[PDB]
Design a protein around this ligand. Structure first.
Ligand SMILES: O=C(O)CCCC[C@@H]1SC[C@@H]2NC(=O)N[C@@H]21
Ligand SMILES: O=C(O)CCCC[C@@H]1SC[C@@H]2NC(=O)N[C@@H]21
Ligand SMILES: O=C(O)CCCC[C@@H]1SC[C@@H]2NC(=O)N[C@@H]21
Ligand SMILES: O=C(O)CCCC[C@@H]1SC[C@@H]2NC(=O)N[C@@H]21
Lengths: 119, 118, 119, 120
């Protein structure tokens, strides 16, 4: 249920493949920020989730460097997949930018993204 | 550089290899929590970082399932590598557990880990 | 403005008064968790926000102890007030529980709440 | 245990009074960022913690406006006070800057501060 294309509330596109082993691989295209086109993403997910009515834990990372540009930053998403007729991946994220010591307070932004199979 | 064996303030062990094209692969062993032995990790890092003294951005994930146990959770670490005399990786992490929709509020813990090669 | 009765997506009720001095005072009643009835809250907000369309920064805290129960925990909400037709307060929160050294990992939960005066 | 002067690893100064009623009141002076001098802070803490080794839950907010300047931002610290030999207040914080809807992703920074009774 995780493999496929996902869309978040910002208009971004998350293309992922969930491996039989627990591997998450794919590309991410952000609708906002210092980003253009697709970026590599890699992550992990619980490949044997509880069959007791709970989501499937997972996470992935995107370093914002590709053949077109480098934002010198990286974002990690942490959350869970919930299946069904209204599938969704609910996440909280941390976007860290490389900084000088003097600027360490500005290194990490926090937010949340909800992904659905629609849009 | 990033490639090597690191330890955080809890005594956890982070063994990682930084690929030339931005990949991070390795193993993680936590000193605390619902975990035992090593777990697979994968991530990404800026392989062409700025040269103005700024750290190198990076991140990685561990899903807490291995051959011995499964905690039905996953942690992501977001941070940066800083070289020099006392090289370190400063991170903030999010640990999400699979939950019911009703328990979503208890789903994600937040913290911070600092790693050094010592 | 900020003064008023707000509700978030969980059904919790946030009753607040924004003082001319930048203070936030009021009560909070959570629809979920280890809580019952009203709890005291206090916080601060920018009483001279920018005039370029930016939101008004604010934050408040609730320690989860009142005359009826004590959860040995406290939550802080950080966010901004957005005026206009549909006024809203968008927040990210941290819920810290008192813990022993051994349970440090479980000390702080992070989430997000959106409030409106509707309900 | 809580009332008094605290310093974080950045050298910021947190002077607070914990009321018998759960109130936290005081001043905060940041060593970094768009700030100068002292700012008003208000917060709350558990006035009857578990006497079992557990810390004392608490939190406070500073809106970064005072008589000298206004950064149009506010920080909330969430954490717990731990007494004993080496007393500390361990916290995680969220700093939200007022932004337009278009700059939402850049609205909230996250970090951590460890406060001690002895300057860094
Ligand atoms: O600006 C940058 O440093 C690189 C792009 C960051 C895009 C962020 S990642 C968190 C959020 N979710 C998205 O889909 N886009 C933004
Ligand atoms: O309890 C669990 O669900 C799985 C183990 C979590 C270990 C956490 S990950 C964040 C922190 N850093 C560590 O090295 N260990 C803990
Ligand atoms: O369980 C507890 O420790 C005390 C109650 C916490 C209720 C949380 S605070 C963050 C979120 N928003 C709400 O309105 N309720 C929950
Ligand atoms: O730059 C600003 O918007 C206002 C000042 C922010 C100072 C931050 S609050 C979190 C961290 N802890 C400190 O003591 N100082 C910085």
């Amino acid at each position: 249920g995780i493999t496929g294309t996902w869309y978040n509330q910002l208009g971004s596109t998350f293309i992922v493949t969930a491996g039989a082993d627990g591997a998450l691989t794919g590309t991410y295209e952000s609708a906002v920020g210092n980003a253009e086109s697709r970026y590599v993403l890699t992550g992990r997910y619980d490949s044997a989730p509880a069959t007791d009515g709970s989501g499937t834990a997972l996470g992935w990372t995107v370093a914002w460097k590709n053949n077109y540009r480098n934002a010198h930053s990286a974002t990690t998403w942490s959350g869970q997949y919930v299946g069904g007729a209204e599938a969704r991946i609910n996440t909280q994220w941390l976007l860290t930018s490389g900084t000088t010591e003097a600027n360490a307070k500005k290194s990490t932004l926090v937010g949340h993204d909800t992904f659905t199979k629609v849009k």
